[PDB]
Amino acid sequence: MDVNPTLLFLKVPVQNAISTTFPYTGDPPYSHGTGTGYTMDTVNRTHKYSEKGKWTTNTETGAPQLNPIDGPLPEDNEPSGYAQTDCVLEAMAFLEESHPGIFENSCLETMEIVQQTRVDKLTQGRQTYDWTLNRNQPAATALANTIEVFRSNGLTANESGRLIDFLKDVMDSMDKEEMEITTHFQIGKKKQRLNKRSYLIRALTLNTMTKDAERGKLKRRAIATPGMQIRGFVYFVEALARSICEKLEQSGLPVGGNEKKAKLANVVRKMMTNSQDTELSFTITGDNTKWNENQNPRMFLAMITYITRNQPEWFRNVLSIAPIMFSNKMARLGKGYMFESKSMKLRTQVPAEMLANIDLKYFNKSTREKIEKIRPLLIDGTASLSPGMMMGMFNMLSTVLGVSILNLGQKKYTKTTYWWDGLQSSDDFALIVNAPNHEGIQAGVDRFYRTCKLVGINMSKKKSYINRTGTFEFTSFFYRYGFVANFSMELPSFGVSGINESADMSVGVTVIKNNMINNDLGPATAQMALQLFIKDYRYTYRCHRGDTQIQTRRAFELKKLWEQTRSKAGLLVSDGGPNLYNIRNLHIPEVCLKWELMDEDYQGRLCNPMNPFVSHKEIDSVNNAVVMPSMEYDAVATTHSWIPKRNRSILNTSQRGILEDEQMYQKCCNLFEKFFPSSSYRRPVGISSMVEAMVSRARIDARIDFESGRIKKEEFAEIMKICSTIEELRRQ
């Protein structure tokens, strides 16, 4: 009897067992080598989707640019980027008509946000392409380097601390005839001068790479990272788009999780109720093919221009800068390639800056064709990519465009017996079409398809399907008369996080509890998950029970602690103790759970503030009250809240000196916390220099203490003298 698991679907509906279709217990696919091939393929495909457009040369950068806007209307079903400007404007106008005042209120809120936002908002994120180093750096590091260069080039509006002043600095730097930066080598400092066009090309460049660990894809794909100059404008544009999306029912963003599921269910049921009882209703689960390679920045500029009508000119300019910068963008090719010689048995790395004029005998047929097609677009080591949105950017503005097309489906606009509505989320969509008969359904689907074609949106025919209303799929949520649970999606979260012992224990128990609450994880399976997690935890941290004979380097200490302890149940699992968790007490921290079972000596040693595994404060001498470290998933800090080592790769590079710098920064920051205690709790805001603020605080504190009698006049005189000395040092 051959075992066929799939046959289980002959009795269990596919949705009710959808979790079986996710093979998320194996490792996900990874990319091994370079991403240059994928970047070249993306650029060539983006230009192919717009080949019938207008070719021009940019007078500021010299890069060829392709303009498909107002291009020929398609005669077939292949993807195309020939959006019609009048149609996009009409879609925006009708969206405004259906929801009066949406754009006005959105613009008011966005004006407040723009006027209030601080520059430190840019420090958020993981990486950022640093134009001063032609590679990726941490966002804070990139911002610091850019501010330093601007200050060296006489661009200091950012001192105001407002993001918009930083954008003014960027705009003013665009007009500089030259820029000067510093470079490191084998760890000296040298000066480099960039002419206007070189700096302009660097400012419009987005780095590219390959994405790793993505589920459900056979082939790899490319992703992009924006530069420092464009982040602020994109942030403001996305704030406006978020404000707009918050006011639309069809929008699937920016809501998520249970709230998103509730909103989608409410919207779908309202659509069902509005449907007449004597007309067919169908639902289309749809995908859009190459959404980001067919959307054009110029159409986003048009949409922003229409949205910001009757608004102050400065607001319109600051919003319009982003599409302007994105339609003149460049793409970094990547690492390059590697060549191998079998006879000589050697390997070498060929950088991507040489692809412009490298002989094509080394490459195979596919790569040779890629390079030949892309060579005309290569400038200064990058590729000219005018059309298309690169990767995962302007998601909410794309959502607005999709929702406008959905809004075009009302009977007041179709002017016939069929109509449609549905749900939009970036590029994914579900479409409910109502019509008296099947021919009406066909006509409505065709009209929706063609209207999407007009605005440069292509419905994926091979990934989209249609059935009767009642079941569909949207953004990986499977609706079968209501959304169904999918446990396999969250399954990778089970295990050991890798923060430390306390945090990992908390994360494991909390994950089990949350999956019980949300993903329909049963009681018995919850208990078995707890057992498996404790097993994995003990094996990872070498903290098996003290009454066992598992051979590990940590077993001797645990055995001694177990033998010297009277109350065993009070010991943590990290100390070789037993497991006291069950269903009823998954919501309680481990240390608090067994606090009333710990020996006094063990409890005091565990929660001893003077433990070198957690740092110490400096108020008075040392805050010897509680173990204090960023305490995520760690309610109570103990000796098990230690911190692991750091990666030491940079020690073999020229950037290792940067370590010193950051250390020194910390030093200074530490001192600032001795004058302003609230800085750690809440972020300080000011324009004065750190030294000036500290000296002023010292003077005012001395005066207040002397007036209130907390200090004697000798200390006051000494503090004033030292303040004067610091003032003298400030000038010298």
């Binding site: 209120n105 200490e557 919501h587 921290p589």
Partner: protein
């Protein structure tokens, strides 16, 4: 002195001086995150890799002076190699477990105070009570609940301001605590934290854990209170419910809210009964709210609400003919009204329904800091007299009275981006939204309300849209006095008589309350409500009532089928259909009943046409006294969470859908069970339970001309066959009996 000396020392050096001089306070945040890079992308893999190393942990240099380099067996506990980018050294977990067993011992007596919330969770779990486990058909609903209760009358920003004031008095910037609650809480916490010896940052985090309120969207069943949401994983499951009561103290407001919800549900289900009073009494005696019998709460709880008053009158307790609105206690001295759903257009171009009360009425409003007498008609404020303490109290009372009057001027004064749906697209109460909108700023409301000259009677002062004491002209119908209080008589519980049909009457004989005056809103309870009876779903929400009604019909399909075939009169009178009949719109009930019953009769007159699904679908609708008519229904409505959801007579519907491939019934997405096939089912494609006086013969037949609508079937005669557009885009040939 140490701070200034260290600052001078740093300023002496060049790099430190440059950093301190060129860096503003704003850029201090940027440089604080400055780093060479945290090259970690797989923390779990990295942890597994590192734990195989000799010295994966980092520790301060002090460890070299506190822990020996080797233990008894010579195993190394730490090394002298520093961590890159810092001055900390590398150590082994053996060091941690050596400290835990041989380190110096301190006094950890204040930890329970620092982490009071978690030990409070432990105490609540310790003293909790466990009941039985019931297996049922759970219907979890996605709603916003609170996971951190925080303080009652505070928000996130207010709590943060209070924390800053208490812990960082000099860092509060320009904020001033204007709310009375904020000032009182600040004083109380300063008194409590007087002469504290804990670090300010940890005190701030403690106050954050104690005071800040946190809410999240979760799929919940039962109670939405914080104490009931912390153990949500234990008490509610996909198919089971565990009875559990937290062991702490219960807030009074939660008890009041739960009592109001329970009373409303009980009264609504009792109205549809043949003997409402006895049903209400037994339901009250069979209900618990958070582990406490409902009768005890009704005895010891002073709640002003219509349904609670009806329950108290049924139990013989003295009541108050008062309700709450906008923070004021309204009490109708005279007049009467009838509710009516009216569609209106908002000032900001929004269309919404409102429950307008018609008729003339007079009320007295009592507030914590204001009092008034109001006289109104249908969407018309006849007059208002306000005697508040200061300008703010009178303004608030005026706004509440204006919104209460349901004036068109008030509706047209709505401006800005005001929404009448939740962020999850769930309907909100229009009156509460209007109150919240106009309480922030009522300048436009006052400007558009109107002005009118006054007669200067009794010396009562005037008031202008600018909120000033005028004497010639004042706001239309509004007057300001000083001697109007009559507040003692508000708490004057009176003895009343309750009729069999739940009509509360005064000693004189005038009607005070009736079931029609109870709100139709279907809310959720803060504390879990437990019902003990044959039907534990008798006073549940609409979705649970629907699913359980159809599940009951399916489970008892054998005797139900026999009874339907033999003696239908007794079947329609089952007590199980009454909760379902409560959901059907009242004005429609009889009509629907009539319709359905006729179908069944035809289903018995014509043999060979016995569809189980049709009978199961339509049976709950035949439980009301029939009203004869000739109307044709293609669907029957049911009120679910304020929306009218339709059940289609023929074919599947969003609510009730039957699947033949699996032979399974789904009600609102919940599996009600699998029907069992009967040999008597008619396998001939003939339907005789769709139209009131017609028999569906087959699919489309082009012989008899084009199809016509359902409502145009009254022109046919006996024996005439015709094509009808009955169903979802389907045309079928039918004949008239």
């Amino acid at each position: 002195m140490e701070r200034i000396k260290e600052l001078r020392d740093l300023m002496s050096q060049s790099r430190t001086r440059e950093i301190l001089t060129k860096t503003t306070v704003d850029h201090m945040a940027i440089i604080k995150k400055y780093t060479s890079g945290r090259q970690e992308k797989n923390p779990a893999l990295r942890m597994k890799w590192m734990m195989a190393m000799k010295y994966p942990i980092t520790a301060d240099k002090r460890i070299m002076e506190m822990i020996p380099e080797r233990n008894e067996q010579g195993q190394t506990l730490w090394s002298k190699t520093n961590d890159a980018g810092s001055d900390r050294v590398m150590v082994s977990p053996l060091a941690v477990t050596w400290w835990n067993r041989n380190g110096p011992t301190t006094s950890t007596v204040h930890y329970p105070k620092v982490y009071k919330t978690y030990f409070e969770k432990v105490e609540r779990l310790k003293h909790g009570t466990f009941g039985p486990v019931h297996f049922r058909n759970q219907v979890k609903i996605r709603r916003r609940v609170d996971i951190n209760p925080g303080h009652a009358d505070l928000s996130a920003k207010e709590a943060q301001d209070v924390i800053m004031e208490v812990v960082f008095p000099n860092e509060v910037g320009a904020r001033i605590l204007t709310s009375e609650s904020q000032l009182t809480i600040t004083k109380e916490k300063k008194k409590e934290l007087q002469d504290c010896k804990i670090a300010p940052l940890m005190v701030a985090y403690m106050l954050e854990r104690e005071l800040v309120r946190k809410t999240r969207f979760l799929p919940v069943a039962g109670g939405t209170s914080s104490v009931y949401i912390e153990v949500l994983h234990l008490t509610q499951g996909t198919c089971w419910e565990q009875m559990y009561t937290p062991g702490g103290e219960v807030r009074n407001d939660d008890v009041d809210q739960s009592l109001i919800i329970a009373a409303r549900n009980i009264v609504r289900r009792a109205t549809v009964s043949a003997d409402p009073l006895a049903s209400l009494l037994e339901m009250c005696h069979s209900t618990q709210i958070g582990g406490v019998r409902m009768v005890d709460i009704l005895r010891q709880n002073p709640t002003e609400e219509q349904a609670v008053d009806i329950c108290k009158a049924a139990m013989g307790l003295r009541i108050s003919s008062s309700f709450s609105f906008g923070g004021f206690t309204f009490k109708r001295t005279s007049g009467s009204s009838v509710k009516r759903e009216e569609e209106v257009l908002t000032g900001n171009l929004q269309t919404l329904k409102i429950r307008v009360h018609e008729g003339y009425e007079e009320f007295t409003m009592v507030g914590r800091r204001a009092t008034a007498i109001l006289r109104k008609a249908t969407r018309r404020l006849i007059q208002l007299i306000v005697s508040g303490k200061d300008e703010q109290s009178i303004a608030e009372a005026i706004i509440v009275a204006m919104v209460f009057s349901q004036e068109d001027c008030m509706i047209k004064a709505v401006r800005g981006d005001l929404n009448f749906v939740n962020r999850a697209n769930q309907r909100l109460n229009p009156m509460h939204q209007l109150l919240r909108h106009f309480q922030k700023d009522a300048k436009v409301l006052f400007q558009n309300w109107g002005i009118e000259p006054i007669d200067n009677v009794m010396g009562m002062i005037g008031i202008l849209p600018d909120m000033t004491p005028s004497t010639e002209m004042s706001l239309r119908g509004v007057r300001v006095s000083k001697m109007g209080v009559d507040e003692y008589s508000s708490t004057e519980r009176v003895v009343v008589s309750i009729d069999r049909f739940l009509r509360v009457r005064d000693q004189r004989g005038n009607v005070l309350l009736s079931p029609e005056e109870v709100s139709e809103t279907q809310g959720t309870e803060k504390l879990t409500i437990t019902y003990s009876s044959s039907m534990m779903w008798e006073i549940n929400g609409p979705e649970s009532v629907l699913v359980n009604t159809y599940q009951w019909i399916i489970r008892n399909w054998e005797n139900v089928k026999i009874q339907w075939s033999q003696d239908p009169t007794m079947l329609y009178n089952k007590m199980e259909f009454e909760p379902f009949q409560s959901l059907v719109p009242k004005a429609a009930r009889g009509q629907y009943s009539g319709f359905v019953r006729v179908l069944f009769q035809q289903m018995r007159d014509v043999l060979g046409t016995f569809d189980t699904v049709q009978i199961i679908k339509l049976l709950p609708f035949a439980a009301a006294p029939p009203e004869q008519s000739r109307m044709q229904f293609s669907s029957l409505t049911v009120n679910v969470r304020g929306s009218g959801m339709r059940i289609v007579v023929r074919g599947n519907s969003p609510v009730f859908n039957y699947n033949k491939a699996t032979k399974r019934l789904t009600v609102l997405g919940k599996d009600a069970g699998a029907l069992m096939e009967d040999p008597d089912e008619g396998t001939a494609g003939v339907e005789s339970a769709v139209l009131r006086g017609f028999l569906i013969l087959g699919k489309e037949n082009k012989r008899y001309g084009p199809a016509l609508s359902i409502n145009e079937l009254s022109n046919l005669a006996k024996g005439e066959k015709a094509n009808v557009l009955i169903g979802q885009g389907d045309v079928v040939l039918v004949m008239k009996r």
